[PDB]
Amino acid sequence: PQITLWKRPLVTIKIGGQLKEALLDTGADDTVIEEMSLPGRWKPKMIGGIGGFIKVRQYDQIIIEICGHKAIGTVLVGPTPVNIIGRNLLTQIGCTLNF
């Protein structure tokens, strides 16, 4: 699809068999999702945003569908205000910016 930016670029995602809304976010290096249960071991990560830094749990090789496109990659879990799909998965789905 082509997504204009007059509104927030929110899409449906599927992760752990559940549907969530997430924001396609070219300003985010990584993908960060609100508290949920994911399989496997996690490792620590600190991520920094507009307000400062938060601690998150890093899960690798997680299956996620983004607006109907399958990705498999790193997903961070923690106190984000919004589920965000960052460049690590945007690249997997072939997402580009165009003007």
Place this chain on the structure above:
Amino acid sequence: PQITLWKRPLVTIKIGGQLKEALLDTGADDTVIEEMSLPGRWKPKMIGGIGGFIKVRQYDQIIIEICGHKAIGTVLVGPTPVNIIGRNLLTQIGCTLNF
């Protein structure tokens, strides 16, 4: 242009007669620039994201040049770690997400 997302989508902008590097950020509602002088009236605003909120100064009707494209809109100024071009100006340059 078509901008891939293998790396941070950084561009050169001209604002207040100054050249700055800034991030094309589809997850940002607004445009926020590191401390600088801008002409005209301003009002305080709180902006939030990962790690919480910061206080900024809101300037309206500011002209910016982004990759050769002129646009006008609100620009926020304050302690952002990165200059961010948000949706209020990305729309004006005809920037879309495509996959």
